[PDB]
Amino acid sequence: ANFLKNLHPLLRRDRNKKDNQDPNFALIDALNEEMNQVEKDAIESKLQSSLKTSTSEYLDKFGDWFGVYRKTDEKDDVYRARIIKYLLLKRGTNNAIIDAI
Amino acid sequence: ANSGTFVMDDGRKNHVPAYMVAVALGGLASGLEIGESITFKPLRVSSLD
Numbered sequence: 380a381n382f383l384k385n386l387h388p389l390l391r392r393d394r395n396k397k398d399n400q401d402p403n404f405a406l407i408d409a410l411n412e413e414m415n416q417v418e419k420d421a422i423e424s425k426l427q428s429s430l431k432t433s434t435s436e437y438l439d440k441f442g443d444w445f446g447v448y449r450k451t452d453e454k455d456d457v458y459r460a461r462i463i464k465y466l467l468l469k470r471g472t473n474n475a476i477i478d479a480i
Numbered sequence: 481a482n483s484g485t486f487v488m489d490d491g492r493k494n495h496v497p498a499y500m501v502a503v504a505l506g507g508l509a510s511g512l513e514i515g516e517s518i519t520f521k522p523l524r525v526s527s528l529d
Contacts, residue, residue, distance in 0.1 A: 397489055397490065398491060400491075
């Protein structure tokens with residue numbers, strides 16, 4: 380969101396008093412809105428690269444990597460908990476069998 | 481004699497009577513050097529009635 384900072388210095392950054400319908404300010408603020416929205420999305424994209432904070436599609440990618448597939452109507456939190464549990468399954472003892480049952 | 485519309489920089493179309501035109505001639509003549517004349521000079525008016 381450095382669009383106005385790296386813009387050509389002579390161009391106006393502020394809607395001009397002489398005209399409330401200044402098309403230059405309109406175009407600049409439009410482009411600036413798109414730049415800031417893309418920056419916002421790029422910041423929020425970090426949550427998808429972590430198993431802890433992933434959501435639907437990327438969480439499905441993680442569960443496909445781990446071998447665990449989403450059930451019908453299975454939300455993100457229970458699904459990630461089920462993946463984590465599936466990785467940490469004790470096996471080979473009475474207590475493990477009892478828990479599996 | 482003439483009256484006309486002056487398009488203000490603010491965007492308002494000032495359709496004004498003839499004495500505002502006389503104000504424009506007086507403001508033109510005030511800036512001209514002594515001895516000069518407003519004859520054949522532009523008036524910077526958008527339209528006339």
